[PDB]
Amino acid sequence: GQQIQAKVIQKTDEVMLLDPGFYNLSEVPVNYLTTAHIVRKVDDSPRENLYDVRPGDVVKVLVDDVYTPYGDMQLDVPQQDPRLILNQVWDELHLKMKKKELVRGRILNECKSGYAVGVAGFVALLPYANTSREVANRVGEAQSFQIKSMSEPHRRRIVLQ
Amino acid sequence: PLYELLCLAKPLGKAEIAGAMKIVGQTVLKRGGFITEVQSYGEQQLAYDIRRPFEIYPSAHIFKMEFAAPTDIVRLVTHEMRVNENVLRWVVVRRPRFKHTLQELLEEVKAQENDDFKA
Amino acid sequence: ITTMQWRKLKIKKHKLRKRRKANRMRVVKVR
Amino acid sequence: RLIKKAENLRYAMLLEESRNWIDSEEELEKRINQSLENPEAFGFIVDLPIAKGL
Amino acid sequence: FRPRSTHQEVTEMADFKNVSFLTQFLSPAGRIQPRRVTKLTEPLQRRIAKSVKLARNMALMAGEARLDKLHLTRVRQEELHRYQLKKSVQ
Amino acid sequence: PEQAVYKKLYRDFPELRKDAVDLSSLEAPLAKQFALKHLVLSAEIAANSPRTRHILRRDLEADPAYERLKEEFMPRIAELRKQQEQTASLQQLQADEEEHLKLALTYVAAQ
Amino acid sequence: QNAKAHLVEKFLGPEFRPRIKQLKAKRLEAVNDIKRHEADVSSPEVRVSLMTYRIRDSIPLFDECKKELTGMRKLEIMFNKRRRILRGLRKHNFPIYSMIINKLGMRDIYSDPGXXXXXXXXXXXXXXXXXXXXXXXXXXXXXXXXXXXXXXXXXXXXXXXXXXXXX
Amino acid sequence: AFVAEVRDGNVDAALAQVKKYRKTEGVNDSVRKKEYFLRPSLQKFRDSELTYAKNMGKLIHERVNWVVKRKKIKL
RNA sequence: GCCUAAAAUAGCUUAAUGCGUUGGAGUAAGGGUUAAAUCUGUAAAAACCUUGCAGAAAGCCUUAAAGUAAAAGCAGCUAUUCAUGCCCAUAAAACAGUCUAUAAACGAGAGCUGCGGUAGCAAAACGGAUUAGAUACCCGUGUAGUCCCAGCCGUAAAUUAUUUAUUAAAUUAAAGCGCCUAGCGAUAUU
Ligand SMILES: [K+]
Ligand SMILES: [K+]
Ligand SMILES: [K+]
Ligand SMILES: [Mg+2]
């Protein structure tokens, strides 16, 4: 699951060889990599095609596995995950709490402890003790709220006032 | 030990419910115990209906009582529930004796002494 | 013990059981 | 020595709890009447605090 | 992503009376989920199973989905609304 | 001894899983620098603590060194995040929700 | 409302506790005279006394519940272990052996006569002799045989024949 | 009791859901057990055979998955 | 202080199934096979909605057993009695061993005697088929038995021989036993 730097050794018609620097050489499809994964170039000569990686370059790869039945490391192109999108939103919410900013949320339904308020994919808790019964009645319309407390990123708990 | 009784009774009037609760309470007091908590939840709708030879009860009145008494009290309470016909279903469960363990008490004592020692 | 050994004993046990039942209801047991 | 202090600490806490304990029938009748006049919610809606002991 | 309760919450609220809480460990058909799905320790797995079985004996839970009790969801929401309003007014 | 703090470090800052590391090198990446600092300061804080009559288990299960280093390394990790792919902002997400709400209302109005 | 101290004392006391806990509390108090010091719970004097008290409390228990075979087997194992402990004490430390016998009201029958012996040890010319050892040694004789029975019917007789303080 | 609502007259879609409920919620397993009685010693052997078949299938597709991951085979 | 597929004791829950079961509605089949038939119905069955009564068993959790209960064995819920196992904190100046000649206890399923119960299943038995024959396999009925309490019987393809040191195992060397000496052949005698 960790990204490592590998050096291109051979580039054949079918397969390309990469050196992870740990043990036996790894194999990758010829056209799997692109010029956007290069961090260090052997030479400064401009490249023409997107799938133009020359031997000697250093590329970023993702370690899918360490032990494989073939006997070599498994390396795959890095990919994306929405978890970062939520993390970026969470950081923004934390900054708003520090700066005492007003957050906009939409009430979805009623909850045991209070009311459920959604904030860009995060469902917060609004205890009835801090509601005027007018905001509670308004469902599906954005309203201003003040963030009071929040849990650690894994827990994903927010309390609104 | 410490026991808790959950009773499902017919949705009758308050006087009938009070009488059923009082019977259990006096049984505990007579044996030499005491009662800690008395609570009622009103009439509740059940997951499925309780059936008697010619009656169906889709709802019941629920109350709970917590008491401390000798180990012989369980049989006495069970007998009272069976005899009374206003009670539909009951259960008695034993609870832990103490809220705080010996380790927790020692930690509190040590913390207090450290504050005194620092002072 | 093998399956062959079990089968060799099986026949003799059957014969003994059959004879005992026959003598179960007789005045003079045949022996 | 510390264990003896712990025992005394437990005794002190139980005294405070004993203020709300009932051992007479007169108090039992009052508690029953108050409980019936102020019903509470069951576990179908709100989680209940489970007793852990005295 | 689905909500998950902490092991501290489970040990504090694992009782047969808390039917709402116990519902998180039941399949949509109303059956008990295996430990490999609940992500619980062996002692906690046993407590949850016993709480559900005891609730069934007391008629607080049903062994399976029942067609004659499909209106309870409406009833529970109506009860929940009244309780929240009463406490808010108080 | 210093391989235990990595689990917490990656949990709080998942972006450290994107910075490529050269396995066959003597230079320590940001993640390894944090671990070494935690090991050094953890012993220092424990030693530089006034002694008391008794030892409390709550103190044994505390780690103020981790909090101090996290504050120190906060600005550095921010630069690493900037080097990664960009994501939609909070305002954009709310706008998308509003548009879908309007679409649902229009469908209801039609039917 | 005022605090009820009398209720706290009852709860902390042995009143609201299972029967086994109450019995065990009495056993420890009964060994306050022979223990070496205020915290001795493992000396041979204390261990043998506790085993003897457990046997006495178990006699009424199994007269009502005659089908709990698991408990009887545990009792039988402890019964044989106590005999071997007393046998060792007599051979190596007589003064400690004497105190235990006197305190618990037992009889001096814990010797090791051996193959060529026919009677118990420490028998003076004036003291009487019995056939307890002959039955144990020459147990194959038909005169000493009995009929098959239940565990309790066979164990209860042996338990009482060693403790003379049980009716 | 599984309830499958029919939308736009797509009866085939409802039938698919019913089969899924039976497999997921263990209705086919109950029917198989109650078809006839087997001793506990014979039921043990029956369970071993079923698990053995499941493990063989898992092994076979484990081999295929590795080929796809390495050679990027479009199967 | 808590836990327990441990044992004994006592209360409680019902998914399904059966019927010389109640009421409503409705009319020709239901059941079973390689293919058929016996059998149950049309004098109102099966199927459908309801009523009553009854016995046994414990879906998901649930997985080995990882409990090992000494072995035989053990998971529906709650409680009592009692015996274990876990944490935390203690204790012993002299005592505690291995193995078993002999002796005793526990001990699946089937079976026997008495008492209560009898839904489902099913030796025996009685019919319908298959086949050269079917005295079996298949189908329809179906009694003992399976269940509860008190006794008797002591038998299984009723687990890997026991112990010390080493060891992942293993291997190596010892301590105390039981059993075997080609097969075949007894209801011998006691
Ligand atoms: K037997
Ligand atoms: K057998
Ligand atoms: K031989
Ligand atoms: Mg016997």
> Collapsing DSSP states into helix, strand and coil, what is residue A107?
strand
Cα A1 to chain centroid distance, Å, stands at: 13
Cβ proximity of A25 and A45 under 8 Å? no
Query: Would you call B39 an interface residue with chain E, using a CB distance cutoff of 8 Å?
Result: no
A112 CA to chain D: closest CA distance, Å?
6
Residue identified by tokens 């008391």 is F52
CA of H40 to the centre of ligand 2 (A): 14
Residue H71's closest chain A neighbor by CA?
A29
Enter the tokens of residue E50: 């016993």
> Which whole-number Å values give the CA distances from H69 to A3, A18, H61, H73, H75, in the listed order?
18, 16, 12, 8, 11
The partner residue sitting opposite H25, judged by closest CB among E27, E66, E67, is: E27
Of the candidates F7, F71, F6, F62, which has an alpha carbon nearest to the alpha carbon of residue F36? F6
CA of C15 to the centre of ligand 1 (A): 25
Query: Would you call B82 an interface residue with chain F, using a CB distance cutoff of 8 Å?
Result: no
Q: Which residues contact G72 (CB under 8 A, 6 or more apart)?
A: G62, G151, G152, G155
Strand partners, F47: none
Query: Would you call F53 an interface residue with chain B, using a CB distance cutoff of 8 Å?
Result: yes
Rounded CA gap, G163 and G101, in Å? 10
Rounded CA gap, A16 and A59, in Å? 12
Rounded CA gap, F38 and F67, in Å? 10
CB atoms within 10 A of CB A147: 21
CB atoms within 10 A of CB G48: 24
Rounded CA gap, D22 and D18, in Å? 8
Enter the tokens of residue E39: 């992500």
Residues of chain F positioned with their CB less than 8 A from the CB of B110:
53-56
**Strand I: positions under 7 A of a protein C-beta atom:** 1-9, 11-15, 51-53, 59-64, 69-70, 76-84, 88-97, 102-107, 121, 150, 153, 157, 184-187
Rounded CA Rg of chain F? 23
Residue D22 is classified by DSSP as B
Residue identified by tokens 């990595």 is F6
Query: Would you call A32 an interface residue with chain H, using a CB distance cutoff of 8 Å?
Result: yes
Could you say which residues from 23 to 82 on chain B have a Cβ atom under 8 Å away from some Cβ of chain G?
32-34, 68-71
The partner residue sitting opposite E81, judged by closest CB among A110, A114, A131, is: A110
Cβ proximity of B64 and B7 under 8 Å? yes
Cβ proximity of A63 and A74 under 8 Å? yes
CA of C1 to the centre of ligand 3 (A): 14
Cα D17 to chain centroid distance, Å, stands at: 6
Q: How many CB pairs under 8 A join A and E?
A: 16
Residues of chain D positioned with their CB less than 8 A from the CB of G38:
none
The partner residue sitting opposite G4, judged by closest CB among D11, D21, D54, is: D21
F93 CA to chain B: closest CA distance, Å?
42
C-alpha angle G156/G157/G162, rounded to 5°? 100
Buried b (16+ CB within 10 A) or exposed e, D5-43: ebeeebeeebeeebeebbbeeeebeebbeebbeebebbb
A63 CA to chain H: closest CA distance, Å?
13
How far, in Å, is the CA of G34 from the C1' of nucleotide I94?
A: 17
Between β-strands B55-68 and B2-9, what pairing exists: parallel, antiparallel or unpaired? antiparallel
Of the candidates G156, G95, F70, which has an alpha carbon nearest to the alpha carbon of residue A153? F70
> Which whole-number Å values give the CA distances from A25 to A4, A19, H65, H68, in the listed order?
14, 5, 21, 19
Q: Which residues contact G126 (CB under 8 A, 6 or more apart)?
A: none
Cα H47 to chain centroid distance, Å, stands at: 15
CB contact under 8 A, G16 and B34: no
Query: Would you call G39 an interface residue with chain D, using a CB distance cutoff of 8 Å?
Result: no
To the nearest 10 degrees (0 to 180), the angle between helices F30-47 and F64-82 is 160
E65 CA to chain A: closest CA distance, Å?
23
- Reading phi first (left if > 0) and then psi (alpha if -120 to 50, else beta), residue G106 is in beta
Cβ proximity of B17 and B112 under 8 Å? no
Residue identified by tokens 């044989």 is G80
CA of G72 to the centre of ligand 1 (A): 22
Q: Report the residue of G1, G4, G9, G10 to disrupt the D interface, i.e. the one with the largest count of D CBs within 10 Å.
A: G4
How far, in Å, is the CA of G83 from the C1' of nucleotide I8?
A: 29
Rounded CA gap, B10 and B58, in Å? 10
Enter the tokens of residue C9: 């004993």
Handedness of CA G54, G55, G61, G67 (dihedral sign): positive
CB contact under 8 A, A129 and E80: no
Q: Report the residue of B46, B51, B57 to disrupt the E interface, i.e. the one with the largest count of E CBs within 10 Å.
A: B46
CB contact under 8 A, G16 and B33: yes
Output the DSSP codes for chain H: -------TT-HHHHHHHHHHHHHHTTHHHHHHHHSS---HHHHHHHHHHHHHHHHHHHHHHHHHHHHHHHH----
* Ligand in nearest proximity to the CA of H41: 2
Output the DSSP codes for chain B: -EEEEEEEE-S--HHHHHHHHHHHHHHHHHHT-EEEEEEEEEEEEEEEEEEETTEEEEEEEEEEEEEE--TTHHHHHHHHHHH-SSEEEEEEEEE-S-SS-HHHHHHHHHHHHHHHHH-
> Collapsing DSSP states into helix, strand and coil, what is residue A133?
coil
> Collapsing DSSP states into helix, strand and coil, what is residue A154?
coil
Enter the tokens of residue D39: 């019903």
Q: Report the residue of B101, B103, B104, B110 to disrupt the F interface, i.e. the one with the largest count of F CBs within 10 Å.
A: B110
Strand partners, B56: B51
CB contact under 8 A, A74 and H72: no
Nucleotide nearest to G48 (CA to C1'): I95
